[PDB]
Write a protein that binds this ligand. Structure first.
Ligand SMILES: COc1ccc(OC)c(CCC(=O)Nc2cc(-c3[nH]c(SC)nc3-c3ccc(F)cc3)ccn2)c1
Ligand SMILES: CCCCCCCCO[C@@H]1O[C@H](CO)[C@@H](O)[C@H](O)[C@H]1O
Ligand SMILES: CCCCCCCCO[C@@H]1O[C@H](CO)[C@@H](O)[C@H](O)[C@H]1O
Ligand SMILES: CCCCCCCCO[C@@H]1O[C@H](CO)[C@@H](O)[C@H](O)[C@H]1O
Length: 326
């Protein structure tokens, strides 16, 4: 057990291993500080969870977040550098701290409402796709992918985050459809990509209905095959009452082709992440031997209704069993 020290930050007492120095608040689920990790030489973000075991819902959430972070081992997806508790036993366990690489720019910061060059767009979207292939292979769907959930460093390395607008959500998410396909996230990539190419938001809806109307105006009324998949006659009648190489003028035709395959209303006909990686638009970056898939992810916990003390114990087990990455 390393030796811990104490310090007052964000209105509570933080207690961290000595390896972590120069804590400085940076945001506030709880609270985040920047630090320097003297063991590794990395700038890190240390998150101290707020009220992790206050209720059944908080406890399950805490367990979910830890299980997710511990599973994610991939260059383009946020990973866990460390997890700790000052507690010496389960009975003493009340606090969880999570550590990852410090991130200081998201994709909005990278763009600044400027068209990126085509080569740049290829490299960014290639990385998002490469991440999404990995996440989707573990049977995980992000469901709210957007620029603020995409960290980019100074060498233009991108990571998918699950933290920091409805503009990039899939339309079926916006309709509380359920039964989501992993291609919900592909919708979102098409929205991001469009914006990188043009410098403008693709579907800047003012409200929920406005957004849906903008979407229908771009990609058109559902076709016959999609209309068969909607049981409600009223939904159909309403949709019909509401109803690329032109909108993306000047762009690389391979970018337009890809956009057309991602921004498809019918989720069952959207390109998958793995098929998108093999699209010609990415020939300069594509490597089929370096687009890894995840180990299987045991999500049996998600359907469980457990008591607080069991969610806390499971979490404690995951804290103890953590092995830092290479
Ligand atoms: C240092 O100078 C800056 C310049 C610009 C800037 O804006 C992006 C910021 C904000 C930096 C920031 O908040 N970085 C950060 C946050 C986190 C973070 N944020 C959240 S909100 C729920 N959670 C985490 C986090 C931290 C550790 C962990 F294991 C998991 C998630 C992770 C990594 N980096 C800082
Ligand atoms: C690091 C990027 C990975 C994507 C993180 C999102 C996957 C979250 O996982 C999910 O949390 C939701 C919250 O109630 C539930 O709706 C989903 O059932 C659960 O699966
Ligand atoms: C502007 C859009 C009008 C509303 C469109 C809602 C149509 C989708 O509604 C959905 O249809 C599915 C297929 O029948 C059902 O399984 C889903 O429960 C329902 O959410
Ligand atoms: C904007 C109003 C029309 C939106 C139509 C969205 C259609 C989304 O696509 C649908 O997604 C479901 C998974 O969620 C699948 O079960 C359906 O088979 C697929 O047709």
């Amino acid at each position: 057990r390393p030796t811990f020290y104490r310090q007052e930050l964000n209105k509570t007492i933080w207690e961290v291993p000595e390896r972590y120095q120069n804590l400085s608040p940076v945001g506030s689920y709880g609270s985040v500080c920047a630090a320097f990790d003297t063991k590794t030489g990395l700038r890190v973000a240390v998150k101290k969870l707020s009220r992790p075991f206050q209720s059944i819902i908080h406890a399950k959430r805490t367990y979910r977040e830890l299980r997710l972070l511990k599973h994610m081992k991939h260059e383009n997806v946020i990973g866990l550098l460390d997890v700790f508790t000052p507690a010496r036993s389960l009975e003493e366990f009340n606090d969880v701290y999570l550590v990852t690489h410090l991130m200081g720019a998201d994709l909005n910061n990278i763009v600044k409402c400027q068209k990126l060059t085509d080569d740049h767009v290829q490299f960014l979207i290639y990385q998002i796709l490469r991440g999404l292939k990995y996440i989707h292979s573990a049977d995980i769907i992000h469901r709210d992918l957007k620029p603020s959930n995409l960290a980019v460093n100074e060498d233009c390395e991108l990571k998918i985050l699950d933290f920091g607008t409805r503009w990039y959500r899939a339309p079926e998410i916006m309709l509380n459809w359920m039964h989501y396909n992993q291609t919900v996230d592909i919708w979102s990539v098409g929205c991001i990509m469009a914006e990188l190419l043009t410098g403008r938001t693709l579907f800047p809806g003012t409200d929920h209905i406005d957004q849906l109307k903008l979407i229908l105006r771009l990609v058109g009324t559902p076709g016959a095959e999609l209309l068969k998949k909607i049981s409600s006659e009223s939904a159909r009648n309403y949709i019909q009452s509401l109803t690329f190489a032109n909108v993306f003028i000047g762009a690389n035709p391979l970018a337009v082709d890809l956009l057309e395959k991602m921004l498809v209303l019918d989720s069952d006909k959207r390109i998958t992440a793995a098929q998108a990686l093999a699209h010609a638009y990415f020939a300069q970056y594509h490597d089929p031997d370096d687009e890894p898939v995840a180990d299987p992810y045991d999500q049996s916990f998600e359907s469980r209704d457990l008591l607080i003390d069991e969610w806390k114990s499971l979490t404690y087990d995951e804290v103890i069993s953590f092995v830092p990455p290479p």
